[PDB]
Amino acid sequence: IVNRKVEHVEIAAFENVDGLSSSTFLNDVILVHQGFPGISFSEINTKTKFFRKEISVPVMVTGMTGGRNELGRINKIIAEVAEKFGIPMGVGSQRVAIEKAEARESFAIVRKVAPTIPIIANLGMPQLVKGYGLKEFQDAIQMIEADAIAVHLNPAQEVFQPEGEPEYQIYALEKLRDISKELSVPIIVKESGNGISMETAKLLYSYGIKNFDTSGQGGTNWIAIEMIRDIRRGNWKAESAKNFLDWGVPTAASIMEVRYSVPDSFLVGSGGIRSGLDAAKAIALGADIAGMALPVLKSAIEGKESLEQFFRKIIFELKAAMMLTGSKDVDALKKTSIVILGKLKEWAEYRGINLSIYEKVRK
Amino acid sequence: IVNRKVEHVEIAAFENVDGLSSSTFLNDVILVHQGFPGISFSEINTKTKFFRKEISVPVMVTGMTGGRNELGRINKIIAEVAEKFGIPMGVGSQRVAIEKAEARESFAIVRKVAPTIPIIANLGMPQLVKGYGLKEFQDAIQMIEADAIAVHLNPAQEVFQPEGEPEYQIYALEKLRDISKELSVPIIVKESGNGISMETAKLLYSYGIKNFDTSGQGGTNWIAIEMIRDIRRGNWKAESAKNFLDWGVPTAASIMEVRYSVPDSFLVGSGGIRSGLDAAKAIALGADIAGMALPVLKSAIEGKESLEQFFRKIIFELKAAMMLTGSKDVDALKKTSIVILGKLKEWAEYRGINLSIYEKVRK
Amino acid sequence: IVNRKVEHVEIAAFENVDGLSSSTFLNDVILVHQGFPGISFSEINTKTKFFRKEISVPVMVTGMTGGRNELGRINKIIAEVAEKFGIPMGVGSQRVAIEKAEARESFAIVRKVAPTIPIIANLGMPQLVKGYGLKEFQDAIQMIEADAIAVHLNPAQEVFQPEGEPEYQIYALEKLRDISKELSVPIIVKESGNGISMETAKLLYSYGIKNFDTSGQGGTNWIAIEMIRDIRRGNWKAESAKNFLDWGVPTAASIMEVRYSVPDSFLVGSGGIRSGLDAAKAIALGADIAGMALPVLKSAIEGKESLEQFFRKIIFELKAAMMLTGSKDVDALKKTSIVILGKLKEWAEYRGINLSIYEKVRK
Amino acid sequence: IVNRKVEHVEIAAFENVDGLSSSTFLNDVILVHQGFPGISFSEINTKTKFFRKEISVPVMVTGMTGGRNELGRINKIIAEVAEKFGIPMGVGSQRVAIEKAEARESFAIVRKVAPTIPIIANLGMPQLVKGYGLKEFQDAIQMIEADAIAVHLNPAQEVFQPEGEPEYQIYALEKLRDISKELSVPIIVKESGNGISMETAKLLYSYGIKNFDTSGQGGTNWIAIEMIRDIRRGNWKAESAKNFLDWGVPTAASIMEVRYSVPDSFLVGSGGIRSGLDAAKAIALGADIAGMALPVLKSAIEGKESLEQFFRKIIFELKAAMMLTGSKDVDALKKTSIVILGKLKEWAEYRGINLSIYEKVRK
Amino acid sequence: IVNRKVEHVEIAAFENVDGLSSSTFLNDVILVHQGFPGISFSEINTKTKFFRKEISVPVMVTGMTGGRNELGRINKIIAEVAEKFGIPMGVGSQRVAIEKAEARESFAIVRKVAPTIPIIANLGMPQLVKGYGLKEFQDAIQMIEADAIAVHLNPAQEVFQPEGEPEYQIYALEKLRDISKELSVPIIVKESGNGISMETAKLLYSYGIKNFDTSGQGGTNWIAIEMIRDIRRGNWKAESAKNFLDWGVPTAASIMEVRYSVPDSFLVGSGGIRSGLDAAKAIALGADIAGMALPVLKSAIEGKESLEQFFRKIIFELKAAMMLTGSKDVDALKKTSIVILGKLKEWAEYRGINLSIYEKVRK
Numbered sequence A, B, C, D, E: 001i002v003n004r005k006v007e008h009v010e011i012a013a014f015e016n017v018d019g020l021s022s023s024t025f026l027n028d029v030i031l032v033h034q035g036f037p038g039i040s041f042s043e044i045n046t047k048t049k050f051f052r053k054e055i056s057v058p059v060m061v062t063g064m065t066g067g068r069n070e071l072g073r074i075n076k077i078i079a080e081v082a083e084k085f086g087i088p089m090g091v092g093s094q095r096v097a098i099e100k101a102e103a104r105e106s107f108a109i110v111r112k113v114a115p116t117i118p119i120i121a122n123l124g125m126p127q128l129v130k131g132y133g134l135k136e137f138q139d140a141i142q143m144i145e146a147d148a149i150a151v152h153l154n155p156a157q158e159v160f161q162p163e164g165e166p167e168y169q170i171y172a173l174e175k176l177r178d179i180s181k182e183l184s185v186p187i188i189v190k191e192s193g194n195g196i197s198m199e200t201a202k203l204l205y206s207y208g209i210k211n212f213d214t215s216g217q218g219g220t221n222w223i224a225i226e227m228i229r230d231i232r233r234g235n236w237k238a239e240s241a242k243n244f245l246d247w248g249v250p251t252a253a254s255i256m257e258v259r260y261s262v263p264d265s266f267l268v269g270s271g272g273i274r275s276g277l278d279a280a281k282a283i284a285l286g287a288d289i290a291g292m293a294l295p296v297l298k299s300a301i302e303g304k305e306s307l308e309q310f311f312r313k314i315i316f317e318l319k320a321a322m323m324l325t326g327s328k329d330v331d332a333l334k335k336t337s338i339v340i341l342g343k344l345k346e347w348a349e350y351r352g353i354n355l356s357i358y359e360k361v362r363k
């Protein structure tokens, strides 16, 4: 509590950037109550598959950090709790540990304290245009004995950074498609707060990507975070960032767009998942699991007991929503009755998402 | 800073008239975020055609002023900055310069400091019913070696002015049609804050006019400006003007209406364009270029450095929206995916704009 | 200013009952602006027919009062101004003057100071329920040399009266149909603030009534007026009236319902008409004439000059809406382009108003 | 209603400058209610002396305008109503009419329609600073057969003028003392919205001035008026004027300061007098007469009838305050019981106004 | 605009810490307006003495920064503008430059571009408790050829720092008294936002300090700044700092306390001076000169022209206050009439500041 944290963690944890001027559109999704659930709360089974492993609840912690000692302390807390609950955990970008051996332990610690759960490696898509490839993926994976690797897209954050220029030439996907052949674990492509559209999902699927993490708008606003970095430097790009605070595909729309355009994908619904009711909605809408990042960071900073109480609350809320929809298991929740209203309805109509066909696909 | 400005400039620059009680409907248009853009920021090309010239960015400054020394100094600042950025500039109505030789310099200064960019001349449609014709158009054009001439429509402003009566007999378009035959440059017909409908666009097109500048409601509210002139005179028309503050076709609806009804038009989207994101929206919706007047005037009054900063910000915001839609160039932006929601969707439905065919036409 | 007025006039003029918790739905109707109107302001012709007479402007003052000296003074003001402007005027219910000779002059004064315009007699439907018949109708007409007689429906007001029991049995319409055979002037059936539905209009038309005045919700709220009378008496019906403050067909929807269900009707659009723009919207939507009551009462109380200024304002606003839709005359305004949005659109869709056929019917 | 008014009249009448960010402190003065007044309403006598004449009510209209035709029309309205009510009227500064013969009639009209009441000429102190002398003072008096001449102080307004440099050297008071020797009528020195302090009153009294008009803060805010002129010119002095909007001695404190420091003065209490109750408070606090300017201007603009209703209201409110303090005449109101509270009390204590002796002085 | 600033400068310039939950009490001080000033604006003389030099205006820029290249750039701007306006400038703490030769140039540059005005060096009282002695003071003075050195007190900022333990033992004052013997320039002791009380002023004067800078609460809130640094680190001291946001002696009360307790002091009135009227109030209350820091930093960050404009406004506001109190020079302003009200009057009463004697002392 004396030394400063890296600036992006300092801002995410302590500034007003969660859902700032943005929306998941989850308020436009209603799960229909069943006054006769047909199940017992104690029979509800929240187990599900995550590649070759079984996990205890259809939630994951998505990648955030690593690379300095204090960041390894936060990673260790999150991993210990994730191991206890049987939930998968992604790490943050491993680029610093690829570059510097001293940064490695703040990632490897995760696997030491969480030997059984799925652990998910992380590198950013622009690194593929800047020299990273098969070897650096394998290094990231072996560092934490990962069961998958996430490749993140963050062009909106990069456009509004004080220095910088997003680079997403098609060569990156050509290289990723090559790497996907040689890796021993699956690739998931995720956004970083601005969501995945049907066009992007279909382009990724054409290069062999089958696993996606929506990371839609409505949760951590990385455009807001770069706006605050720009404010702190007296950088005029801050006022430009302000005009883009509601840029991106809202999480509920991105889950519908990826499930509809890639019906057989393995889909993580994330970006603004803050309760187990949000998690249930994301699954019923079409995700296979719900992901969360910021609220886990905030609770882990408060400490291990805070984070265990956080997962207790999320799991309770998910099971309440399953009980009150008569969903005895995760498969039943994916098929349960919903109502779609409001702006989400209008988004799907304009985008050509024929709801009857949608309903069949999501199940 | 001692002498009063002309009354309409004083009010537009310093009273609350920008979007007063009115709306562009641009908030109902969303550009769909592409988390894999397929391009590098440094590859984005914003060049586009403006008649026989290329311009650097698909934006123009539309006509505002001229005719007095202090107005000449604002024109000179705006023209030097436009020249430096490679953007077209319209001047304000040249009627006073046609009438008085001493008023000419405050228009001509534009072409002196901006020898390369397109410069657009300006006369009012009602002058055509009051003796102006071919010679006065040629004179307006020669005064600034213009590349085009804008003919403005402002009946709403004229209805509420303390004095006066709009005159828009069809003879004006008969005369404009004859003129267009003899002129060496194209004619653009523009509104002045209340927008172009399908009926107006089709009537103009039927007299040979193919170049339109929407100047929709949502930006400078000229009904509110005359309301303020009437308030200042103790004139009761002020309360009637109040009842019409939201009169007009909103800029986004007018861009759709003109593009749908006149698919081969060259279309400036203006009226309440206040960021490069608004500009990108207007182009994606169907415009060829985005036009701005009031914010350029306010920054030019602050000075040359303020207006250079203003254009740097608009350009950066337009490039951010192109980067985040995967639009490598202006042609790509015109075909990028959008969502239309809300009142703009209801407007297009009632007006018979078949969205399937809309999407095809805008591209 | 020393003696109290009759209670319903005192409440209407001075309590907050105009539009209380109620809506005309006119905000959902947009008149499409035409930047090239095709006319000059001075050629606009506002003349129209009202039965066998021509009137100067398509607006009428609907019935409000009469029956005491002070009410006769307000009637004289309204009538002299109406005569000067060439606009028709209805009087308030003539029941008291049928009952008492001393109450006659406060009605007859209207024809004395207004010899040329149309003057519309008034009796309530509940008087036909109670045995008024042909002679009392003839006497109401003769008293003011009326050009028509309006029969008002006010069941909502009657239900919430401290004393009240409305009776609206079908034999009253049998009596009215018999009476219509023997009168020299046409009958108009109007509501009193809660609007005419398609069922009510079709029922009235089946008994021979062809002239209707909507008197929809959104203007004077007569449920609110009786709520206030109940409050002043410590009567618990006030809380019940509160629950009905938004009861009734909104003016814009009643115009649509009557014009669609009775396409040949002569239709006054009234209830909450408060500007010339509201008047123009009522006519473009399907009315022949716009009617107003409360704002005329409030201005007449202020005095003759205040009421002349009031009409000047309404007329100017109507002509501005005509000018800015390119409507050279009232017939053109009836066919001008509009947009219907919002709740009005949903109301019409649910009620089976096929908008295509609506547009044809209204013109 | 078509030509613009002179700028300071346009701003005063129609912008929000009455009491802007300023206070009369009259809310800190309570007149003690007397439940047994000892008089009947009809015996109240409001007559008082104004120099050699008797006036009907202890109120005057203070100087505002003149010098153009339209300003002459407002002066004629005020003067005819003042003559009808028996109240004195001052004219606005006569500088323009001293400079230009064509501007004379807009002042002289006052004496033509008001032959009997006191009429007070007006010139500014800055004219004495600039070499106006005895003949220009005599000419200002003769122009309207004035009964007195007011010399106004307006340094605060002059400091914030776009153009301004106030000069208030002691030789002007030497000139004024010389002039006073040779005039046939008395001089009143008044402020212009920022109030007379004890230092200023004692300095003026040392040069022979015995008649003062407080013109304190809380009413028309002339710093605010010049702030608005600076805003309209894009002049940065506007922000400085903003910081001074509450500069000056509040009217109630200026009445106390002048009556205490100059106990034999003839004292007009003005600045923010807006009701007959404010007028009665000013007199009970120590003024001889209450003066008003802005509300008279606003009512005269409305018309003769509006200004007659205005005076009827002020007079009735004054007589109600006289009745309810048991004050049968103006002398009694001057001695009636009051309470001083709040900031006014603290102001007086800090300024060394021994309230015991204050009560004796005021009476 | 790309690299981060040092954290205290980032927070002060761009977070909401000016006057946060604190008050100068300057709103309780009124300068009495003089409607006959007795002077001309052009004759007002703002020159005054600052030790052995004459300065152009009685305002100084107090110490803020230096020690890194970007901090040297801001110092260069402030010193160039200060030299232009003839106003003294203090630098920020020189500790880093005593420690590291590379940090010297970012202070020295001040004397290079400002060869004439008074420059004031700066070290903290905590360096005397640690270890600094005569040579390090001499070195700070020679580094910039200073005309005086300020020694700052900042115990409240130190208490709330994430790492802090303030130490203010009396041997530091013994050391300062010994150093003062051997310096060739005077020492000023200043606070840093929490004000100087009569106890602290008397204690300092007993060790030979004769020059003081109040730096009261109401301006830059350094407990707020440390509160935000604590929030950024997740440090629970932030909630404790919250409870102390309004800790300290308000600037106006600190000026009265130090002038009353040390009547012969040379006194800078600072902490929340934001306009020339604030500056005038501080001088009239008892200060010799008014000091500012934060608004100078914010303008310097915008650029040299912004800073020049900021000083033009301050000087104009000061001269307006001088003009409107009839104060021909600074000595006159120091004796001009005031009113003290409200909490400031209560504070002085409770603290035994006999206002009679106060008046005499301040003059």
Ligand SMILES: Cc1cc2c(cc1C)N(C[C@H](O)[C@H](O)[C@H](O)COP(=O)(O)O)c1[nH]c(=O)[nH]c(=O)c1N2
Residues within 6 Å of the ligand: A008, A009, A012, A062, A063, A064, A065, A091, A092, A093, A122, A150, A151, A152, A190, A191, A192, A193, A215, A216, A218, A219, A220, A270, A271, A272, A273, A291, A292, A293, A294, A295, A297
């Ligand atoms: C502090 C912190 C840091 C990072 C992130 C987030 C946070 C809060 N996120 C993005 C994260 O995985 C997730 O996609 C978004 O934050 C949206 O989910 P939430 O709204 O936060 O639940 C992230 N994403 C990733 O792929 N690589 C990483 O290095 C990081 N770093």
Ligand SMILES: Cc1cc2c(cc1C)N(C[C@H](O)[C@H](O)[C@H](O)COP(=O)(O)O)c1[nH]c(=O)[nH]c(=O)c1N2
Residues within 6 Å of the ligand: B008, B009, B012, B062, B063, B064, B065, B091, B092, B093, B122, B150, B151, B152, B190, B191, B192, B193, B215, B216, B218, B219, B220, B270, B271, B272, B273, B291, B292, B293, B294, B295, B297
């Ligand atoms: C002060 C000023 C003056 C003018 C205008 C505007 C302003 C702000 N505009 C209309 C302008 O070109 C534009 O169509 C509208 O103002 C809408 O765009 P903005 O919302 O202002 O960006 C205008 N247009 C025109 O064709 N001739 C002209 O003389 C003027 N004068």
Ligand SMILES: Cc1cc2c(cc1C)N(C[C@H](O)[C@H](O)[C@H](O)COP(=O)(O)O)c1[nH]c(=O)[nH]c(=O)c1N2
Residues within 6 Å of the ligand: C008, C009, C012, C062, C063, C064, C065, C091, C092, C093, C122, C150, C151, C152, C190, C191, C192, C193, C215, C216, C218, C219, C220, C270, C271, C272, C273, C291, C292, C293, C294, C295, C297
């Ligand atoms: C004071 C007053 C008195 C009456 C009325 C109204 C008012 C305000 N109205 C109803 C009126 O004609 C009209 O239908 C409604 O008031 C709705 O129009 P406005 O919203 O008032 O313009 C009414 N109508 C009627 O047919 N006979 C009448 O006696 C009266 N009395």
Ligand SMILES: Cc1cc2c(cc1C)N(C[C@H](O)[C@H](O)[C@H](O)COP(=O)(O)O)c1[nH]c(=O)[nH]c(=O)c1N2
Residues within 6 Å of the ligand: D008, D009, D012, D062, D063, D064, D065, D091, D092, D093, D122, D150, D151, D152, D190, D191, D192, D193, D215, D216, D218, D219, D220, D270, D271, D272, D273, D291, D292, D293, D294, D295, D297
């Ligand atoms: C429109 C207008 C114009 C003038 C003024 C006022 C107004 C409103 N006032 C000042 C006026 O006499 C009076 O002292 C102040 O306005 C304060 O009183 P009110 O608050 O306005 O009642 C003013 N006074 C003066 O002595 N000579 C003048 O020429 C004018 N001009």
Ligand SMILES: Cc1cc2c(cc1C)N(C[C@H](O)[C@H](O)[C@H](O)COP(=O)(O)O)c1[nH]c(=O)[nH]c(=O)c1N2
Residues within 6 Å of the ligand: E008, E009, E012, E062, E063, E064, E065, E091, E092, E093, E122, E150, E151, E152, E190, E191, E192, E193, E215, E216, E218, E219, E220, E270, E271, E272, E273, E291, E292, E293, E294, E295, E297
């Ligand atoms: C960014 C910045 C940094 C510094 C300061 C201020 C600011 C704004 N201040 C305190 C400054 O001199 C002054 O006493 C207080 O800020 C109060 O005055 P203002 O309210 O800021 O005008 C300060 N004082 C000091 O003696 N040595 C220093 O190093 C600094 N550093």
